[PDB]
Amino acid sequence: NLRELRDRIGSVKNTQKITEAMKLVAAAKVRRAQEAVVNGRPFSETLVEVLYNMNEQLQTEDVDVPLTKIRTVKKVALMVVTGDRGLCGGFNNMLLKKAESRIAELKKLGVDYTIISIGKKGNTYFIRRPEIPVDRYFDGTNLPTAKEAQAIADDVFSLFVSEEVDKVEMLYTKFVSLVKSDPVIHTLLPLSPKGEICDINGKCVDAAEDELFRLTTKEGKLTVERDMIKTETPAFSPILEFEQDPAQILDALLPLYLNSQILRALQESLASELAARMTAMSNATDNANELKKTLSINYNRARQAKITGEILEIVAGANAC
Amino acid sequence: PLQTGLIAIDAMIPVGRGQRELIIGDRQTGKTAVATDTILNQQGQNVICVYVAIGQKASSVAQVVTNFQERGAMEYTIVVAETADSPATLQYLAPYTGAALAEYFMYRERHTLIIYDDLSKQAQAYRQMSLLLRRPPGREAYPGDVFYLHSRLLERAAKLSSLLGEGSMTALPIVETQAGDVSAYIPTNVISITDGQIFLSADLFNAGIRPAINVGISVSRVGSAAQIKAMKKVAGKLKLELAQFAELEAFAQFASDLDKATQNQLARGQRLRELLKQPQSAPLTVEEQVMTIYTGTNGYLDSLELDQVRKYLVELRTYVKTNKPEFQEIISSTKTFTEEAEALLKEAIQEQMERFLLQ
Amino acid sequence: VSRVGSAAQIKAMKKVAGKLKLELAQFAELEAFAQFASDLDKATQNQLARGQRLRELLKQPQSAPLTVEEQV
Amino acid sequence: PLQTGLIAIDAMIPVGRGQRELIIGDRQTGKTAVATDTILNQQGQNVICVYVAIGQKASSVAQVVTNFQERGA
Amino acid sequence: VSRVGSAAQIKAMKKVAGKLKLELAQFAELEAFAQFASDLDKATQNQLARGQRLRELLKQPQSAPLTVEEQV
Amino acid sequence: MTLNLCVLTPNRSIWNSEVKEIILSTNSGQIGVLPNHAPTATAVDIGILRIRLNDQWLTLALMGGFARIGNNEITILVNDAERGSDIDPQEAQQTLEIAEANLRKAEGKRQKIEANLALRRARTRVEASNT
Amino acid sequence: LQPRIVGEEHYEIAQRVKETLQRYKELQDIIAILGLDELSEEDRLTVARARKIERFLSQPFFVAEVFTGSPGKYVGLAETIRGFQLILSGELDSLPEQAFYLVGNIDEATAKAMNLEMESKL
Amino acid sequence: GLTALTMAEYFRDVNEQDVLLFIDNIFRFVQAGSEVSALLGRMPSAVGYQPTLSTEMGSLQERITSTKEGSITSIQAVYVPADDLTDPAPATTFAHLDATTVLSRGLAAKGIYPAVDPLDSTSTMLQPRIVGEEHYEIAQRVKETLQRYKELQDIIAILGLDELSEEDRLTVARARKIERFLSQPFFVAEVFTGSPGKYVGLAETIRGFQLILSGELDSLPEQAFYLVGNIDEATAKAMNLEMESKL
Amino acid sequence: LQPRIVGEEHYEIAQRVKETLQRYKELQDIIAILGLDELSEEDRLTVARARKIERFLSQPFFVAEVFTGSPGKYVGLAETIRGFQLILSGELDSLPEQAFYLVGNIDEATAKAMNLEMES
Numbered sequence A: 001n002l003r004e005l006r007d008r009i010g011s012v013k014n015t016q017k018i019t020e021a022m023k024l025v026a027a028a029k030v031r032r033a034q035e036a037v038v039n040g041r042p043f044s045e046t047l048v049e050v051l052y053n054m055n056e057q058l059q060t061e062d063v064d065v066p067l068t069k070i071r072t073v074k075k076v077a078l079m080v081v082t083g084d085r086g087l088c089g090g091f092n093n094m095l096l097k098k099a100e101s102r103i104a105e106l107k108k109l110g111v112d113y114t115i116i117s118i119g120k121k122g123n124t125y126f127i128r129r130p131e132i133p134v135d136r137y138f139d140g141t142n143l144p145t146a147k148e149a150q151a152i153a154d155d156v157f158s159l160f161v162s163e164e165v166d167k168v169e170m171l172y173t174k175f176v177s178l179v180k181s182d183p184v185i186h187t188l189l190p191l192s193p194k195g196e197i198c199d200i201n202g203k204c205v206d207a208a209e210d211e212l213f214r215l216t217t218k219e220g221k222l223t224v225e226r227d228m229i230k231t232e233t234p235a236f237s238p239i240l241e242f243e244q245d246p247a248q249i250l251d252a253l254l255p256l257y258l259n260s261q262i263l264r265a266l267q268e269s270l271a272s273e274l275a276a277r278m279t280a281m282s283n284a285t286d287n288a289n290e291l292k293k294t295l296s297i298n299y300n301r302a303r304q305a306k307i308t309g310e311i312l313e314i315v316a317g318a319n320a321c
Numbered sequence B: 001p002l003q004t005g006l007i008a009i010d011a012m013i014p015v016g017r018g019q020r021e022l023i024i025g026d027r028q029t030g031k032t033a034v035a036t037d038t039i040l041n042q043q044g045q046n047v048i049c050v051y052v053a054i055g056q057k058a059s060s061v062a063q064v065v066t067n068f069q070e071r072g073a074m075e076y077t078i079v080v081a082e083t084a085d086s087p088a089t090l091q092y093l094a095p096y097t098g099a100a101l102a103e104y105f106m107y108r109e110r111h112t113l114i115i116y117d118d119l120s121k122q123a124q125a126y127r128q129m130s131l132l133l134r135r136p137p138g139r140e141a142y143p144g145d146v147f148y149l150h151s152r153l154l155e156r157a158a159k160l161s162s163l164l165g166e167g168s169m170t171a172l173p174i175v176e177t178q179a180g181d182v183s184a185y186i187p188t189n190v191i192s193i194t195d196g197q198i199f200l201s202a203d204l205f206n207a208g209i210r211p212a213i214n215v216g217i218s219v220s221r222v223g224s225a226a227q228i229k230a231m232k233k234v235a236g237k238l239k240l241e242l243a244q245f246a247e248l249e250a251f252a253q254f255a256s257d258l259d260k261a262t263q264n265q266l267a268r269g270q271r272l273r274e275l276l277k278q279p280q281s282a283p284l285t286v287e288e289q290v291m292t293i294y295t296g297t298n299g300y301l302d303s304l305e306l307d308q309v310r311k312y313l314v315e316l317r318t319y320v321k322t323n324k325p326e327f328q329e330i331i332s333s334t335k336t337f338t339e340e341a342e343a344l345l346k347e348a349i350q351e352q353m354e355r356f357l358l359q
Numbered sequence C, E: 001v002s003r004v005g006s007a008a009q010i011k012a013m014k015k016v017a018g019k020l021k022l023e024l025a026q027f028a029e030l031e032a033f034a035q036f037a038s039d040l041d042k043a044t045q046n047q048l049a050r051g052q053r054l055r056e057l058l059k060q061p062q063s064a065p066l067t068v069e070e071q072v
Numbered sequence D: 001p002l003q004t005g006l007i008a009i010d011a012m013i014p015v016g017r018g019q020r021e022l023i024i025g026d027r028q029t030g031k032t033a034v035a036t037d038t039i040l041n042q043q044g045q046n047v048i049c050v051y052v053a054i055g056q057k058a059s060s061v062a063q064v065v066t067n068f069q070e071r072g073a
Numbered sequence F: 001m002t003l004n005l006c007v008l009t010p011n012r013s014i015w016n017s018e019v020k021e022i023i024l025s026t027n028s029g030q031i032g033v034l035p036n037h038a039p040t041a042t043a044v045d046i047g048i049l050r051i052r053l054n055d056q057w058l059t060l061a062l063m064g065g066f067a068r069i070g071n072n073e074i075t076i077l078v079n080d081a082e083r084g085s086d087i088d089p090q091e092a093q094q095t096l097e098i099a100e101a102n103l104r105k106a107e108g109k110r111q112k113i114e115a116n117l118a119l120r121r122a123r124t125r126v127e128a129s130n131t
Numbered sequence G: 001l002q003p004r005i006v007g008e009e010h011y012e013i014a015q016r017v018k019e020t021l022q023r024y025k026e027l028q029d030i031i032a033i034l035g036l037d038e039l040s041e042e043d044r045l046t047v048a049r050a051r052k053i054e055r056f057l058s059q060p061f062f063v064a065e066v067f068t069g070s071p072g073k074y075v076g077l078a079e080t081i082r083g084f085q086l087i088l089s090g091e092l093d094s095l096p097e098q099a100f101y102l103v104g105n106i107d108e109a110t111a112k113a114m115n116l117e118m119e120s121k122l
Numbered sequence H: 001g002l003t004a005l006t007m008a009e010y011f012r013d014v015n016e017q018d019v020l021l022f023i024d025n026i027f028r029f030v031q032a033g034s035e036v037s038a039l040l041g042r043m044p045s046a047v048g049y050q051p052t053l054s055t056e057m058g059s060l061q062e063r064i065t066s067t068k069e070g071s072i073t074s075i076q077a078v079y080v081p082a083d084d085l086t087d088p089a090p091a092t093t094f095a096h097l098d099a100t101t102v103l104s105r106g107l108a109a110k111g112i113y114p115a116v117d118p119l120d121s122t123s124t125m126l127q128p129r130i131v132g133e134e135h136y137e138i139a140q141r142v143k144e145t146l147q148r149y150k151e152l153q154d155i156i157a158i159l160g161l162d163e164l165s166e167e168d169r170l171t172v173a174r175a176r177k178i179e180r181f182l183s184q185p186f187f188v189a190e191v192f193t194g195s196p197g198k199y200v201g202l203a204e205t206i207r208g209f210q211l212i213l214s215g216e217l218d219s220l221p222e223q224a225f226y227l228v229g230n231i232d233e234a235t236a237k238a239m240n241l242e243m244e245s246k247l
Numbered sequence I: 001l002q003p004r005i006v007g008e009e010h011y012e013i014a015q016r017v018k019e020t021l022q023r024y025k026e027l028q029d030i031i032a033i034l035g036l037d038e039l040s041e042e043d044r045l046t047v048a049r050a051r052k053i054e055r056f057l058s059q060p061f062f063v064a065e066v067f068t069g070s071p072g073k074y075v076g077l078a079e080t081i082r083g084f085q086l087i088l089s090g091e092l093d094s095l096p097e098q099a100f101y102l103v104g105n106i107d108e109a110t111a112k113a114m115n116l117e118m119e120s
């Protein structure tokens, strides 16, 4: 039946057009998540302008702020930022491959891992196995705002200011490249008074230094390149007055600085999800192109063999009478 | 022009006088209704229609003549009819009988339309005689003459010169395909013979796009030389903007996650397909077609829900018919979308949109 | 394919072009997952940029054959 | 060995003397070229070439005969 | 297809397996459709369980027949 | 002609128009500002920000943070902030009732940290809906 | 199936049923590849109604009682028109899809859905 | 087709001229031989054609040749049945063909005349041993520039030009200048458009696209290459527009 | 291939090879377009084992030593049944898939798995 073979080509030609428009919808979304970080760029530039100078002015061993307070690591929380939807690479799988290896590492240390799951693809993985301690499930979101982030900040804040949990660490996918972006783990809490932000392994970047992702083109393709930007810290005026205390101002700055590392982790995990999907919809629309070509060739073989076999039945009957 | 009364044909696949156009699709798609509503449109034009019905059920020949006699179409119509009970010689010679009657008026300076209700059944009726006459067959047991059957028929239908009197014979052969097999032997012949093809699809007939014209695949080799100057101006925008909507059919599921340059094109193209929808045996006059495409291709339907785009244009076509009758005289006589009539039409839209919003 | 592979060639060609047949067995698998990996390490980025210039060995102009000394 | 001069044959798909070897491909993929360059390489060897052109362009055969005259094949 | 239906059965088999043909046919529609959704509700998830137990009833080793008693 | 003022949240800058009079709550409790104010760095409380420009004066609730002031420039870094008119008036006081019962059911430290922090976030959200 | 013959109440629902099942026929390809979650909430709704229309088109016959295993049903045209007006409007979006399978009336589909809610508890 | 060809080879052999033959089209020559053979009662070949199709085509196509006296070059339209290039009617035709000129409905919508697709048109003649290296190097750069711009049209609709790299800001501007400079006015359209046509030689074509691709003409506007013949006529239209814009 | 002829140990593993290669046969329209990334945890494990079964089905031949140069290996049925017991029990899931290609025993698949893991 050639009608069934024409329907298979017309649905693969439909599948090629769907999975190509999903590539461009994901191409519009990673660019819209590129823009969403640069909107939040004046906030964190000014917050680091403050936080480098409050640690400069302070110079006092008597100042201990409870988001910088170091306790003993008997328990450890881990917030994992997953995707909400499927069809995006091996994005959510390599993330939970990395979450399992951190659950494994804290059992060699024997220090009671704890999970905070964000996103529907983690809510599922974490709820499905009940022999894993999870505090709260969070609705993951596209376009995260301060409000969705504030709730995440609150769970992180209230779980740490009480002495049940030390060293809230976090693993998420930094958006490095389109096809390969490994999930790297950071230690969110306890914040460093310096504001240096560092990974669990032990590499700390200066916080005046953070890089934006800018999706551009190389030779033919669409690539993303992370340019490292240094913000210069001006000097706080000599005449400047402090309102409460340099310890009481710093106790209000670090909830702003903890809210910002959460929101930047959501927006870099968001662009990594939407570019894993753009990579997946690029490979699906090119596999469907290679399929549609060999279905068009195998149809024409069956089309021509049908006509040749049909006439040779007729020319045999035209001679046999 | 040969005004068929359908917007999807007379704007984008225009049939002129002297043109052989092909109405083609699978069964129960609306091929007869495209041909019947074309005959029903020329009650005011002085064309003479010949409706040749080869190999049909006799009950459906009686329903077409009943449709024609009610709407006054038989004052200018011959129905040639060979029911499927008849011998294959009568079915083979029935469009040649219809074409000989249409050549009578054409040589007497009169313009004519002819419709062959399935050339597919004529080819099967000449295959019947040829296989019984022991003539050696080809693809699908047809003889070699089945191209020369239909090319000897359809080339008799064209437009004459002023040295003969400029009679025309516009052939609209209807060919039925089998599961959309355009590459089948009798569709392959007539697509080669005919200027234009009007592709009718059952996946648009079930979705509500009626008449189910697949305007993307359908072509017209005469092109815009058929259309009047009023229709060339307005349907230059309908062709481009339904082509921009054709590239964005994959994006209609994702209208939110897009910029405004793309999302307005998805919003415009979904109302431009509501322009094309006509009920059966409701052909539009050329003035009513220019209003409908000027309104849709110039932003005056973006405020409406798709349930109301049908109800708005029916009330706006009956508005200008009554309240603003000076518009029809500009397009009937000058046959150009003049800057006077573009001003007169916009006054009708903003008064109808005010009355339609109140409702 | 060729049915008499090694029986045809001379001993210079059996010795030297045996390493050629195994490198293109390697480089056929390395061109796969090259853009998937995109972080080409020196156990692969050497063996790919070797394999691209193995093709440049194979390009000849038309109507210009090479002698057996020149092939080896 | 029968040396074709093409490195890709003579190293990797080597044709011996007495072997039937098929040159198979689509139209305009250099099939006549692999056959022609094999004939051009038999200059030093005591190999008599025979070229049969079945059903081809007479202009295409005349180019091949001139390329044989030009190169002493 | 059996074109005689439950007239070719005893009353005991007709009481039990009288609807089994159209229940497995409607299950095999929804099992193929249940691969298309991620999170599916319990009234589907119950019927995916019962349908996969009705498939396991029907498997037999060769030439080890079940009596009509054992079949009901 | 005056001081300019910017109120910027971690993703969005709310205010960037010149005003003459603000009065910000703080951990002290209340501070009035007129232009040519000496540069000062304060922390801001989770409460309202009443702003008086030329004719009309309005309040934008902010959820606490940091407010430094310089040579006629007030940058305010606040981790969430909503305008006092753009909150719909009764609807916050429904959400205040969702918090007021939730502190009555608060038990343990972390639920007495989270409710009381979000209550004061919600109780100073309604006070902009009326102001 | 013309409004001059059957009226415009029968005809407008006979179009909306065929538009719904044509829309679901176009989607079976991409829900096989990409799943139900990629659809819009407008397209998940017209999928879910076309699941329920297709079941409700089925009917037990008096002659097919040895194949269906259940007693047959004669269904009037007014009962047919009333039932498909309910599936298309969305007033039956809470019932499961198997409630519409081999029922005569739309009163039989809802009463089957009450038995499926009770036996879910059992 | 043969009758037309016999006139074409009188001008070749006797008048020693160079003739164009035009067969519109060569598929209808095939199907007319398929119809005669079926009427003559021949047992048909594969896919319904005549069993003599390889020689009926070969009889017409081997008379179309360059002799020592003159040449006949035939530009013959080709219909592909069922959009199958492996069908015996194109497969026997394409064996005798030496170049394919794909005309484009999409390029005519932009306004480019002649609406020849540059990327899907092929030749066996565009080999560096035939046209020379200076022509072969430039035709590959033009194809690689137009193929890169065909890839970037989805990225310009997502990013825009200001976000593309500087290497790829040029290959859009140059490729938009090539798409204009491929267009040309014709002598047969001097009544239709009024603008006089231009015969552009092969010498002025290669020197034209060398200047656009070497980047010397990146100061000129886009609409200075549209419907111009020579590359000198390009800068003349541009300097007119700099003198027309200032007024 | 019936248990009264081949034995019951041979017949239950010839079924399990064919149940694995049938399930991977059905999955090659899903992994043809989307790839391996969208398969479930069970269907990825069936793809992983059937991708190792297909290469251990291959074998170097004595007759084919003039094509490849690698020596052929006679593989007895007692070696064949225990070599597919190990892939279906999953005790060789850690080995690479290219370790199973063109080796006689499952021991040679083990010794080849070392050199692919050893050589750096």
Ligand SMILES: Nc1ncnc2c1ncn2[C@@H]1O[C@H](COP(=O)(O)OP(=O)(O)OP(=O)(O)O)[C@@H](O)[C@H]1O
Pocket (backbone or CB within 6 Å): B026, B027, B028, B029, B030, B031, B032, B033, B034, B176, B210, B211, B212, B278, B279, B280, B281, G001, G002
């Ligand atoms: N524009 C339209 N809107 C609604 N219904 C239509 C329209 N055109 C045709 N129909 C209906 O579609 C049905 C089929 O149309 P028609 O009889 O013209 O089909 P046909 O193409 O001649 O098929 P066949 O050759 O098999 O009879 C008819 O019942 C007709 O009433």
Ligand SMILES: Nc1ncnc2c1ncn2[C@@H]1O[C@H](COP(=O)(O)OP(=O)(O)OP(=O)(O)O)[C@@H](O)[C@H]1O
Pocket (backbone or CB within 6 Å): C060, C061, C062, C063, D026, D027, D028, D029, D030, D031, D032, D033, D034, H095, H124, H127
């Ligand atoms: N090794 C090569 N290097 C450069 N150019 C080549 C090479 N081989 C072939 N060509 C060119 O490729 C074109 C096609 O080659 P050729 O005609 O030999 O192949 P073919 O398949 O026999 O063609 P056809 O099927 O049309 O007869 C020729 O014009 C030739 O100039």
Ligand SMILES: [Mg+2]
Pocket (backbone or CB within 6 Å): B031, B032, B117
């Ligand atoms: Mg009909």
Ligand SMILES: [Mg+2]
Pocket (backbone or CB within 6 Å): D031, D032, D060
């Ligand atoms: Mg050749």
